[PDB]
Structures are given as C-alpha cells and as structure tokens.
C-alpha cells in the first residue's frame, strides 16, 4: 500500500466521471503516472473512442512511484463506488504488480472506514495515438441543450445530421414515422454567460452520426456545464466535456457518405 495513493477529497467526482462513460465501454485500462491518470478505451462497435484525463490538481493527494497500468471492468467499479457516501474521502491504493486495488472510503465526522478490494483484469489493447488536427468547425454549447436536442431527435430516427454554416447550426433526423429539424443560432448574453451558444466556422460542415452513440455521449452532461463539439470533413467528431483538472473526450466516427 505504498506504490500508488490517490485521494479524492469528495468521492462523488470519481463516481460521476465513471458514470460518464460506463454505458459505452466495459473494460478500461487506466495508466497512472507521476503526472496524473489517463485512460483510453474503444467500444464494441469500434466507432466511438473514449479518452479521459485527470490531472494532479483534481486530487487532494496523489503519489505514484513509477507508472502503473490497471485494467478494470467498469461495471464492478461502478458497483463498488455506490457503496460509499458522496461526501466521504475516497483513496485508491495500489501496489507493485497489483492483482487488485483498494478503495478506502473515509468519513471525517464519524470514525468509520470502508475498505473494498476490486480485482483487476488482464486487457490486451493498444493505446491509439490521437494527434492534434485543425478541425474546421468548433461549437461550444450548454450541455443541457445538447442533451435535450439529441434525446428529442433520437426518438424519430436512428441517425442525426449536424450541419454547420454561416451563423446557423442545424440538427436533422429522418425516420419512417416522420422527420424532425432543430435550428440553433449563435447567441451571447453578458447577464447569463453560461447559456451563450458560440460558433467558429472556417469551412461549412455536414456530418451524420448514430443516435445511439450521441445518446451515450450526452450522458457526460453531468460532469460539465458546457460541451464543445469540434467537427471536420471526413474525420471523427470530438465531443469534449471539460473538468477542473482534466477532461472527457468522445471521438465519434461519422457515417460514410
């Protein structure tokens, strides 16, 4: 119990982060290094790539001797994380060549300690190299509005088309029962800066995506108040939810023309 010690002052943050992407990926490999914890995973369909970053500033304390790799099944981790109150301190403890990790929930007012052991999994996967690309589309919007639009459009069709051009965003869904179109425009308010929909178009964009994957992505709305969507011509769309010290990124592969 010396190699890796990471303390979340509040156990709710880690639970929410795991909840953000537990419905798309099942087995996830977390790499913990002296700089923080990163994670990369791919869903069964191999079209959605989930990336997670958590820096040392999100931890009350964080000590890692040398880098450690932990394979975890998110279902068991989520089940374990439900056993601790959202206000207790959560310590993740790991050792050398660990076969299991220790999750210690500690409450200050009471003299109660809840120690759980989670067995680790052997996962064989490659860490895809995500190189920065100059997306010719960037729209930052409130997470609630994006979730509402995605949920509304997913009811009608199985695919949703996002269209970006000068001062207009169009979400279109077409299905057997009918069709549904939603038009948003850039808007800024100094009195309520948290609802300011923003757009930055270098070239018009038009991309179709699966409703299921967008529905899974919007589940991260809890983590952050705003979502940033960066779109391209023939490259995966990036849906980013920003955290205090890290981020949660979803790279979604668009449907072929």
């Amino acid at each position: 119990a010396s190699m890796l010690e990471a303390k979340f002052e509040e156990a709710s943050l880690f639970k929410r982060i795991i909840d953000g992407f537990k419905d798309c990926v099942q087995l996830v490999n977390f790499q913990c290094k002296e700089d923080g914890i990163i994670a990369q995973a791919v869903d069964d369909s191999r079209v959605l790539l989930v990336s997670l970053e958590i820096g040392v500033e999100a931890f009350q304390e964080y000590r890692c001797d040398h880098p450690v790799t932990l394979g975890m099944d998110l279902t068991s981790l989520s089940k374990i994380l439900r056993c601790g109150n959202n206000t207790d301190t959560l310590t993740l403890i790991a050792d050398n060549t660990p076969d299991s990790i220790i999750l210690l929930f500690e409450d200050t007012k009471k003299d109660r300690i809840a120690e759980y052991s989670l067995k680790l999994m052997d996962i064989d996967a490659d860490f895809l190299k995500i190189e920065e690309l100059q997306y010719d589309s960037t729209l930052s919007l409130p997470s609630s509005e994006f979730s509402k639009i995605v949920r509304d459009l997913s009811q009608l069709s199985d695919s949703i088309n996002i269209m970006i051009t000068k001062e207009t965003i169009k979400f279109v869904a077409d299905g057997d029962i009918g069709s549904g179109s939603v038009i948003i425009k850039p808007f800024v308010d100094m009195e309520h800066p948290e609802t300011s929909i923003k757009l930055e178009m270098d070239q018009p964009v038009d991309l179709t995506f699966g409703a299921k994957y967008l529905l899974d992505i919007i589940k991260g709305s809890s983590l952050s108040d705003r979502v940033g969507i960066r779109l391209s011509s023939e490259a995966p769309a990036l849906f980013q939810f920003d955290l205090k010290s890290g981020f949660l990124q979803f790279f979604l592969a668009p449907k072929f023309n």
């Binding site: 791919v42 369909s45 191999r46 790539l49 190299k129 790279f251 449907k255």
Partner: protein, 493 residues
C-alpha cells in the same frame, strides 16, 4: 509480463500465421480472397455485374464446414491481408433482434475510428465477421432473419461462419450470401505440419500411423493436435504398437445424419450373427436416438428400395415388406400414443424397435437405388393447404348447400365442375353470364373458382383444360367479374 511458449496450447503455439499455411480447402480460400478483394469494385457496380467467378452479386459470404478445419482462421487472415478493420461477434455476445438492431446495425454504414487513427485505402472500413451464427437461438427474436436482412442491406463486407448449414434456422440465408464450403482436410496436406510439430515437440511418431489418427478425429486438425499433446505427456512414441488403443480411446462419437442412419440401419451385415454380435441391438436402438424425429420416416420411405440379404428360407421379398409395413403401422400407433395428452415418452425406446429396427431387420440388405428423403412431410403440407381451401369454400357455400366439407368435396364439386368450367368449353365467351350467376347464387369468388378447379384428380385434371381456354375468354371473365357487385356470405366484423 509475457507468456512463455511452453505454457501455450499446441493449437495456439502452432496456429497459422499467413494464408499459405492453411491446410486444405485452397479453392475455398482463394474464392473468399477474390470475393473480398473486389468488394469495392462490385459496390461501384451496385453488386449487379457478376464476374467470371460470379461473386459480384453477393454483399456477404457464408463459410460452412465441419468443426476444426480452419474457417475462422481463414476468415481473419483474409480480412487482415486486404487491410480491413475487423468487428467480430460470436455466441458469447447477445445477438438478439433488439441488440443486433442497436449494435452492428450502425456499424454496417459507419467509419472505423480505429482505422482512422491507425492510418491502406481499406483500413477505415469494417469487415463484420459473425461467427457461430448457427448457435443463435430463435426464429424472430433470435435475429437470424435480421442478420439475413442485414446481409441484403450491408454497405461493408460481412462474413458468416457456421458449422451446420442445412438447418431450418439457416433457411433465411438460402440465397443471400456467397456459399463457401470447407471440407475435411486430407492427410497429405497436414502430414508436413504434423511432422514439424512432432520434431519441434521432441517426440517420435511413425508417419504411417498419421492416417489412422486423422481418421480417428474425422479430419479435425485441432483434435489431432490435442491428441498429440495429451499422448506425448507419457507415451513418447506413437507407432503401430499402440495405434489401436489410441484410436479407440480418442474416437469421436458423432451422431449420424438421417441419410447415414437410414443407410446403416438397412444394411444386412449388422443383422447377421457376426454382425449382430459386433453391432448389438443396443447399438441399433441408440442409432435411432441420434434423430428420433426423422429415423422412422426415413425407414418407412426407404424400406421398399432394397435387395434383401436376410430373407428367411421360403420367404419372398413381398412377404418381408408386408411384415415390415405391419410393424410400421404398430409403431405409428405407438407414436400416436406417445404424443398424446398423457405424454408417454417412456415408450420412446419401444417405438425405436417397432418403427426402425424390426422393420429394417426384415428387409435389410443392399440399397436398390438412392436413399430418398421422406415425402410424407410435403404431402402432409399439401393436404393441409387443400383442406384449408376446402374449408373456406364450404363455409362460403354453407348457406346454399346441405352437407359437410367431405360431402362437398366428394359429391357437390363434380357437379359444380359441369356448371363452372365445362360451359366455357362449349359456349366459349358466351357462358360468362351463366357462370357468374351460378357463382353469385353460392356466394363464390374467383379465387374460390380457381381453388375448386384444382381439387379434381385423375381423369378430371383441369390444368391443361383451363390453359387451353383462349386468353380472351379468361380476360373477359375477369373483367366481367370485377365490373359487378357480388353478394357476401360471411360478414367479418
């Protein structure tokens, strides 16, 4: 950490690495490779311009063959060689209708994120390999029909692998995939690999006993390798001195198929004294239990197509046939007893004797022709269809006739034939009015007319008679019927 090769199964340590290491079924592998290599070109042609091989009219391929012959390995290797991303599903995953519609359905026309982030011109597309499709359970909720529809609407290559192609559940896949067959590898194609494995594993195997081992596993390479690994633990030498015991111990016990069961059951050799002492009555009864739903039907179908070799002195073939038929009737009575409300399944063994074993023993000999499949099933379906039609007609004409369906078929229909079809043959197109009047008097429809005219049998067959009618007469009949208001007998509400 890493896994030392000493801790890996021989089937994994000695698995093929390239398509040139696959033993046997070279033609099948080449066909699959050609079909996958020109998939894009066929897509540009909308999969309508069948090529020299004729594989240009298929958006998916279905590989079938016995277990352990190299189907999955061949599929994966061909997918990797051409440079495609592979999305694999199997029986360990849920592939129901809803799950299939929420999963691979989207991947059918979606780009691969792994392909994009790992970049060939085909690495961004998916090669969906659905393995163990035969293991799927269900007719509508199972998703087999949904997978068949996906095969029709797939926008990317899709490969299906199964072990039992000829099953009712695989009916939807009849003519939607390129059917590729992998057959049991021959001994020569695998002899070199077996020798290499033996010299690598440092044990002595005589090349002459190889054929016996390959016959023991019925062509299963994986089983052969497993046998080698197991025996080499203690017995370091495989030779003729111990081949018999090894073959007997590791002899696969695979249930025969209806045709094979019928062939073996109707062989006189097993009914002789030596044959009976070798193939015992218990073995014969067990042979019936390989498929208890089809064995009696096969026996009843093929017990009249033999040259017997077990005839008793002074007994002719016809007498043995009659005894077999009597026992088959008794077995049918027992079968009726079994599947009643009482559910007397404990009588199943007795049925085996009364339906297959005893009747076969009376006509056992050499097949006098080809083993045919039972025709009772199709005839029963035809009878059911005709009975449904007769019921509809009887209840359409119920208000006008005083009889039952059997009486209608046997008495009324022949008379109706002389007032519905015969006039057209004598008065030409001038009999339409009278025929329509008669039809209305009995609330009969045009479909009822057609169904009536199909019931007559023997000398009263009408197909040629109706066809010989001038097309103008039939067209006028249809026009007149469709240009009038006809009465209705049963008002469905």
């Amino acid at each position: 950490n890493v896994v030392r090769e000493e801790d890996k199964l021989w089937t994994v340590k000695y698995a093929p690495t390239n398509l040139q290491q696959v033993c046997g079924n070279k033609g099948s592998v080449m066909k699959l490779k050609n079909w996958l290599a020109n998939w894009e070109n066929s897509k540009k042609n909308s999969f309508k311009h069948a090529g020299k091989d004729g594989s240009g009219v298929f958006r998916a391929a279905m590989l079938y063959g016995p277990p352990g012959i190299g189907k999955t390995t061949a599929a994966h290797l061909v997918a990797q060689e051409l440079g495609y991303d592979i999305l694999e599903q199997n029986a360990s995953d849920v592939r129901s209708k809803t799950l299939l519609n929420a999963g691979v359905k989207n991947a059918l026309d979606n780009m691969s994120v792994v392909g994009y982030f790992k970049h060939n011109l085909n690495g961004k597309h998916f090669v969906i390999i659905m393995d163990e499709v035969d293991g799927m359970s269900g007719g509508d909720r199972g998703g087999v029909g949904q997978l068949a529809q996906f095969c029709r609407k797939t926008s990317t290559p899709l490969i299906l692998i199964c072990n039992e192609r000829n099953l009712p559940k695989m009916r939807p896949f009849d003519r939607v995939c390129l059917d590729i067959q992998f057959r049991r590898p021959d001994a020569n194609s695998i002899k070199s690999r077996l020798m290499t494995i033996a010299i690598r594993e440092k044990f002595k195997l005589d090349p002459n006993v190889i054929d016996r081992l390959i016959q023991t596993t019925r062509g299963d390479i994986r089983q052969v390798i497993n046998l080698l690994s197991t025996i080499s633990t203690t017995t370091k030498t495989i030779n003729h001195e111990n081949i018999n015991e090894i073959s007997k111990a590791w002899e696969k016990n695979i249930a025969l198929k209806p045709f094979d069961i019928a062939h073996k059951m109707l062989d006189g050799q097993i009914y002789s004294d030596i044959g009976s002492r070798n193939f015992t009555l218990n073995d014969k009864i067990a042979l019936y239990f390989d498929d208890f739903d089809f064995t009696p039907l096969m026996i009843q179908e093929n017990y009249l197509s033999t040259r017997p070799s077990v005839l008793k002195p002074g007994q002719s073939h016809l007498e043995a046939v009659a005894e077999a038929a009597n026992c088959i009737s008794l077995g049918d009575i027992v079968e009726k007893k079994i599947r009643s409300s009482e559910q007397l399944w404990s009588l199943l063994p007795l049925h085996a004797v009364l339906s297959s074993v005893y009747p076969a023993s009376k006509v056992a000999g050499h097949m006098a022709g080809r083993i045919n499949f039972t025709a009772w099933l199709g005839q029963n379906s035809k009878s059911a269809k005709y009975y449904r039609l007769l019921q509809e007609i009887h209840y359409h004409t119920r208000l006008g006739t005083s009889t039952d369906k059997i009486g209608l078929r046997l008495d009324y229909l022949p008379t109706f034939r002389k007032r519905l079809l015969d006039p057209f043959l004598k008065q030409g197109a001038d009999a339409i009015s009278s025929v329509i009047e008669v039809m209305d008097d009995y609330y009969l429809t045009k479909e009822d007319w057609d169904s009536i005219m199909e019931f007559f049998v023997g000398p009263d067959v009408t197909t040629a008679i109706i066809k010989k009618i001038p097309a103008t007469v039939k067209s006028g009949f249809t026009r007149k019927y469709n240009s009038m208001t006809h009465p209705v007998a049963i008002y469905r509400t």
